[PDB]
């Protein structure tokens, strides 16, 4: 039977070349005798180039291949939460089967143009620099980009951790389920990752799709789609979901590897002509639906690894061009003490304030502005043998505001805590304080109001802004704390 | 089964079997040769013809020559009787001391440990090297990588670690030389012996050795690491011990593959590499790992072609490490050895929660100032130093002294430095830097800080220099 | 003060000019590396 089954003509470098299979559809899952699956990516006149999902040691010339008739779909829904699954949705945390009812297809088209509405609900990270100057809204696609080891995955993690404030809450329209896709990473990193998340009690609301370093190319390829589907189940059901693709750089490599082995034509950097289309069809599935559709959302934090800061290399160019903004991390900043290494001047949020809270805006706005102003003069500092007090002023606001954007890891803040601290320097209170102390000030200052003043923060929170009152109360709280502070 | 050779082109040999086609990865032995020639099956070309990679020279092979399927991937003698010995890609002793009488044999090809087999303990592994320890601490059972272009210190650094760590280590050690210099395996073997890590008279050997040097055909080079790694996995799993794995240089495994790649009929990926580089590296790097059964502490030297860290190979390897020591010819060029780049070296344990805040604040303190100085370098270059704020000409000072205090005379490079090797303890390091950063030596001269161990030697050296 | 003013006017203007040139040199180089790296891949692929 050459219609529903085929015979392997040759097998190598994970590409199977099957004879027969006359009825297979493009991208169909097929099965080799040995039990290994494969996906038909090249339907040629005289053969099927099949992408083997595993070790090609188990396939020989002549092995019989049969069709499944089924296209790639994966488990989905609420039972995956707190689980560690492979790219096919299989459980790899050895905790037992995932009790999944619904199964969704991994590659589906993004919701069209009509079914959506402007991104308007804040997606809070807990990171002041991001939350005040590179705001993410639900349904937005914001890229975290930077060289190796700059703090990229940390941003995502702090972000995931942060959602417990709302996941332990009652308001079900503020909860955000998290999905973390690990592509090309080593297993020890993910293990370490899931640990950090368990320790913070964030695994309860997180799903981990993992396609690691030793998993065949095709699984690394798929991973992001199969994780996307999982997040779509939430989006579609009036629920909100967050997805982190770590990294899109490694998946591009996986895809390039199959493309070239199937012999498709190579373009710049050896990438196939459809590499742009591989990510665009992925990153567009993230969106903010309309109430007519459930008002549910899917926010995506895709990671791209640049090289020597070459944001214009091929893949970094595509993805930058596809997403709504970028958080640019930099080594120089990192080693200079700015952690997280966000380059505030080049980072962006097309969505902008349409996603900031009124509380934040109340402060974010002047901060954004003195910083931009400092950035103009900063370089002068170190040779400012005699600058006027006009600009000498902006250098001072400059370094203090900058110290306020600093942040340790695993400790995401509540929007109310961020504005209280930002207010402190923005209003001028730390202007006479020593740069070397702002980190210590904030820490203790924030410890104090989180202890003693939970009623003002609750106000700020509730009233959503800084009332003329709470404004006055903060003035005293900081002018007395500061006095205390320099005793 | 018996196949015949149909084509020979370099390290690649195509074989035609009449009945029974040997599976991919199977090792075949060429009949009619003074020495054992193993061919690893690489592909099924179809028409009952397999394409294979030779594990040795292909000279004198003839079209039609006979080849027997051994029925299994390359399998080597694994076990304790490998210790103190020197093996081949294919498991043959190459030390002239007779057979290796192991109870068992293992195939060099195997699946990597599952996700549920991973471990996450993180213990700093002190080495005695100021720079590493201070800024990019190694971790027991972790994956370590020494990156460097030709001749910047990868091997010497591996040499001083064998001395400062392998030597006291209570457990085995496996040193796999992959595509490196033959002269070097002879230097190390004889050093192991002169120091009793290798014992030729008794069973006190604490190190097994495996070699596939630069004088070998691509094939051997594409597999020795596997052989080496396989020996190490035995002590990890079947004995459950604490292993120390040294590989110099893992880049050679990847260069080996790129060298036959075209003869395997593949469109090249970027920079000439083969399109399967990352996956080829992945299925290997994923076995070099600590599990719940045993622990591996791998120190891998990683060559950097053209000195370009973005080269697909060095570039693809960062993700497999928990700590990285990046060496730089720009630093070396100044006479600063070890030439580690303080701003490009990292460790997963550089966490206040793991090494402590004193350790952490010093490290980051040292890095800020070196960064601060890096930025000014290009500028005082042209505009000079007068206009600089006393605040800023002090960081130039301290930086230049730290830059030096980071160098150290290794005990394995006296032939190089003309200085006795010093091993500094973690607290002597943290403290020394803490004080320089604190302004406590702004009076001593930079030179006093160059090529010395502990901070006291910098103070003594100041006097000696005092005239 | 009039000579430092003058000297620093020039220096600053030379700098900017240097900036404009290095930038243009950067883009020419950036384009040639990509083109160069791509022709190399094509040559290898076509020879097969």
């Amino acid at each position: 039977d050459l219609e529903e089954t085929g015979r392997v003509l040759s097998i190598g470098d994970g590409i199977a070349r099957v004879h027969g299979l006359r009825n297979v559809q493009a991208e169909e899952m097929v099965e080799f005798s040995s039990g290994l699956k494969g996906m038909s990516l090249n339907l040629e006149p005289d053969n099927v180039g099949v992408v083997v999902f595993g070790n090609d040691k188990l396939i020989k010339e002549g092995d019989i291949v049969k069709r499944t008739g089924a296209i790639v779909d994966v488990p989905v829904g609420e039972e995956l939460l707190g689980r560690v699954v492979d790219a096919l949705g299989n459980a790899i945390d050895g905790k037992g089967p995932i009790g999944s009812k619904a199964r969704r297809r991994v590659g589906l088209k993004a919701p069209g143009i009509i079914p959506r509405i402007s991104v308007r609900e804040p997606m809070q990270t807990g990171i002041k620099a991001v939350d005040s100057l590179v705001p993410i809204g639900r349904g937005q696609r914001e890229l975290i980009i930077g060289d190796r080891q700059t703090g990229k995955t940390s941003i995502a993690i702090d972000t995931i951790i942060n959602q417990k404030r709302f996941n332990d809450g009652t308001d079900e329209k503020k909860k955000l389920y998290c999905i973390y896709v690990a592509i090309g990473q080593k297993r020890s990193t993910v293990a370490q990752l899931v640990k950090r998340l368990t320790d913070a009690d964030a695994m309860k609301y997180t799903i981990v799709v993992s396609a690691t370093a030793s998993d065949a190319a095709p699984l690394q390829y798929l991973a992001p789609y199969s994780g996307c589907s999982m997040g779509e189940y939430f989006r579609d059901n009036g629920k909100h979901a967050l997805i982190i693709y770590d990294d899109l750089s490694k998946q591009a490599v996986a895809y390039r590897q199959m493309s070239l082995l199937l012999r498709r034509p190579p373009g710049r950097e050896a990438y196939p002509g459809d590499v742009f289309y591989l990510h665009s069809r992925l990153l567009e599935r993230a969106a903010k639906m309309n109430d007519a559709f459930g008002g549910g959302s899917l926010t995506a934090l895709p990671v791209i690894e640049t090289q020597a800061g070459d944001v214009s290399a091929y893949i970094p160019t595509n993805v930058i061009s596809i997403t709504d903004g970028q958080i640019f991390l930099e080594t120089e900043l990192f080693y200079k003490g700015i952690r997280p290494a966000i380059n505030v001047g080049l980072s962006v949020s097309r969505v902008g304030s349409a996603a900031q809270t009124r509380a934040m805006k109340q402060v974010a706005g002047t901060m954004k502005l003195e910083l931009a102003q400092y950035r103009e003069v900063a370089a002068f500092a170190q040779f400012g043998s005699d600058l006027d007090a006009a600009t000498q002023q902006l250098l001072s606001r400059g370094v203090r505001l900058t110290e306020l954007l600093k942040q340790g890891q695993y400790s995401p803040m509540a929007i109310e805590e961020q504005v209280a601290v930002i207010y402190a320097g923005v209003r001028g209170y730390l202007d006479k304080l020593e740069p070397s102390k702002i980190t210590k000030f904030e820490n203790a200052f924030l410890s104090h109001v989180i202890s003693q003043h939970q009623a003002l923060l609750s106000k700020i929170r509730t009233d959503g802004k800084i009332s003329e009152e709470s404004d006055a109360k903060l003035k005293e709280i900081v002018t007395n704390f500061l006095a205390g502070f320099e005793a | 089964t018996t196949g015949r050779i149909v084509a020979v082109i370099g390290a690649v040999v195509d074989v035609q079997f009449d009945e029974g086609l040997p599976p991919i990865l199977n090792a075949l032995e060429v009949q009619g040769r003074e020495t054992r020639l193993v061919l690893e099956v690489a592909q099924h070309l179809g028409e009952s013809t397999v394409r294979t990679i030779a594990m040795d020279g292909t000279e004198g092979l003839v079209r039609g020559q006979k080849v027997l399927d051994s029925g299994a991937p390359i399998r080597i003698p694994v076990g304790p009787e490998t210790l103190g010995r020197i093996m081949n890609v294919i498991g043959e002793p190459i030390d002239e001391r007779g057979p290796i009488k192991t109870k068992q044999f293992a195939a060099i090809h195997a699946e990597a440990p599952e996700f549920v087999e991973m471990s996450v303990e993180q213990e700093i592994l002190v080495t005695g090297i100021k720079v590493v320890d201070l800024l990019a601490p190694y971790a027991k059972g972790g994956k370590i990588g020494l990156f460097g272009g030709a001749g910047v210190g990868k091997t010497v650094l591996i040499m001083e670690l064998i001395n400062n760590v392998a030597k006291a280590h209570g457990g085995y050690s496996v040193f796999a030389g992959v595509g490196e210099r033959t002269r070097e395996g002879n230097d190390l073997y004889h050093e192991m012996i002169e120091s009793g890590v290798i014992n030729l008279k008794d069973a006190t050997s604490k190190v097994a050795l495996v070699y596939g040097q630069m004088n070998e055909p691509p094939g051997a080079r594409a597999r020795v690491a596997l052989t080496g790694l396989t020996v190490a996995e035995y002590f990890r799993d079947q004995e459950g011990q604490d292993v120390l794995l040294f590989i110099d240089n893992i880049f050679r495994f990847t260069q080996a593959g790129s060298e036959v790649s075209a003869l395997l009929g593949r469109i090249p990926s970027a920079v000439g590499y083969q399109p399967t580089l990352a996956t080829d590296m992945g299925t290997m790097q994923e076995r070099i790992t600590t599990t719940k059964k045993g622990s591996i502490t791998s120190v891998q030297a990683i060559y950097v072609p053209a000195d370009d860290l973005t080269d697909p190979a060095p570039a693809t390897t960062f993700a497999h490490l928990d700590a990285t020591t990046v060496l730089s010819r720009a630093i070396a060029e100044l006479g600063i050895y070890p030439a580690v780049d303080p701003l490009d070296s990292t460790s997963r344990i550089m966490d206040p929660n793991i090494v402590g805040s004193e350790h952490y604040d010093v490290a980051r303190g040292v890095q800020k100032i070196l960064q601060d100085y890096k930025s000014l370098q290009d500028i005082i270059a042209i505009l000079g130093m007068d206009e600089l704020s006393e605040e800023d000409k002090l960081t130039v000072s301290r930086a230049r002294k730290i830059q030096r205090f980071l160098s150290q005379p290794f005990q394995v490079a006296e032939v190089f430095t003309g200085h006795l090797g010093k091993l500094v303890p973690l607290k002597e390091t943290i403290k020394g830097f803490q004080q320089i950063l604190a302004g406590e030596y702004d009076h001593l001269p930079e030179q006093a800080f160059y090529m010395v161990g502990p901070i006291e030697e910098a103070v003594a050296k100041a006097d000696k220099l005092a005239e | 003060q009039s000579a430092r003013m003058t000297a620093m006017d020039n220096a600053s203007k030379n700098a900017s000019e240097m900036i404009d040139k290095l930038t243009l040199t950067f883009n020419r180089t950036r384009q040639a590396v990509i083109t160069k790296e791509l022709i190399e891949i094509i040559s290898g692929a076509a020879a097969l």
């Binding site: 370089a379 | 505009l383 | 600053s12 900017s16 240097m18 040199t25 950067f26």
Partner: peptide, 25 residues
């Protein structure tokens, strides 16, 4: 002509220009 070096030079000249324009005024 290395995109690395070129960038290294641009880095130090943009600062020079800045400090130098300041000194002029």
């Amino acid at each position: 002509a290395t995109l690395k070096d070129i960038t290294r030079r641009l880095k130090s000249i943009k600062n020079i220009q800045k400090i130098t324009k300041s000194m002029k005024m």
